[PDB]
Design a protein around this ligand. Structure first.
Ligand SMILES: *[C@@H](C(=O)OCC)[C@H](O)C(=O)N[C@@H](CC(C)C)C(=O)NCCC(C)C
Length: 219
C-alpha cells in the first residue's frame, strides 16, 4: 500500500455537507462512500440525496434523524434499485414521507463489504477501493471543537462509536512517533475543523474505533 493516499486529489469526493440538527451522520457517510464508488465506475461525481435515505430506508433498519447505519443505507439502495440525486431530493435535516422517484435516480449498488476490524485492513481498503464509511467515537468536546492537526483523545473508546464519517485517505506528518493519521470527511459544514476535515490518529491502537465498523458499497 502507498505511504500516503488522498482521494480528494483525484476528484472522488463531493464538497463537505452539513447534517444540521438531525442524527443523520449515517446517511452522509453512506452517500460519501457511494459517491466515491459511483465516480470510480462512471467518472461522474454527483452529489447524492441523504434525504432519500432519511425518508425511505426505515424498512432496512434506519431511523431517520434518530440514527441509522451505513450498511442499512447500502442495503436500501440495493433493495430500492436506485438513489436520487441531491439536486432533485435536497437535504431537509428532518424526516418526512418517502418521495423516492426512480426518474431522478443517479446511483445504485449491489451490496456492501464489511472490512476486517484492523487498521491495516482499513489501510488496504482505502488504498485500493476509495473512500470508506467508518464509525468513530465523536462524543468528546475535544472533537466537537477540533480545529487542526492530528486529533488524539486519550479517553476515546474503540468500541463506543457513535458517529459515521468518511475516510478519504491517510498519511504521515513529516517531523516518527505518532505521526500517522487518517484523513476523515465530517458532515458538520465546511467551517468545522480543517475545511470540514479532521486528521485522526492512525496506528495508535484503533483510536476512537475507526477500524471497528468500516464498510463500502459494491457497484
Ligand atoms: C450519527 C450522528 O448523526 O451523530 C452526529 C451528531 C447518528 O447518531 C447515528 O446514526 N449513529 C449510529 C452509529 C454511527 C453511524 C457510527 C447509531 O447509533 N446506530 C444505531 C441506532 C439505530 C437507529 C441503527
Amino acid at each position: 500500500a502507498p505511504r500516503s493516499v488522498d482521494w480528494r486529489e483525484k476528484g472522488y469526493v463531493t464538497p463537505v455537507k452539513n447534517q444540521g440538527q438531525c442524527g443523520s451522520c449515517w446517511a452522509f457517510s453512506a452517500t460519501g462512500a457511494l459517491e466515491g464508488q459511483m465516480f470510480r465506475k462512471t467518472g461522474r461525481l454527483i452529489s447524492l440525496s441523504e434525504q432519500n435515505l432519511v425518508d425511505c430506508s426505515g424498512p432496512q433498519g434506519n431511523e431517520g434523524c434518530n440514527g441509522g447505519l451505513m450498511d442499512y443505507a447500502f442495503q436500501y439502495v440495493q433493495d430500492n434499485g436506485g438513489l436520487d440525486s441531491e439536486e432533485s431530493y435536497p437535504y431537509e435535516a428532518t424526516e418526512e414521507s418517502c418521495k423516492y422517484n426512480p426518474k431522478y435516480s443517479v446511483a445504485n449498488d449491489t451490496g456492501f463489504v464489511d472490512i476486517p476490524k484492523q487498521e491495516k485492513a482499513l489501510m488496504k481498503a482505502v488504498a485500493t477501493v476509495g473512500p470508506i464509511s467508518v464509525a468513530i467515537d465523536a462524543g468528546h468536546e475535544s472533537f466537537l471543537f477540533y480545529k487542526e492537526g492530528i486529533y488524539f483523545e486519550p479517553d476515546c473508546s474503540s468500541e463506543d462509536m457513535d458517529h459515521g464519517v468518511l475516510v478519504v485517505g491517510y498519511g504521515f506528518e513529516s517531523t516518527s512517533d505518532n505521526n500517522k493519521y487518517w484523513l476523515v470527511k465530517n458532515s458538520w459544514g465546511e467551517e468545522w475543523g480543517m475545511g470540514g476535515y479532521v486528521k485522526m490518529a492512525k496506528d495508535r491502537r484503533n483510536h476512537c474505533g475507526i477500524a471497528s465498523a468500516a464498510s463500502y458499497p459494491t457497484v
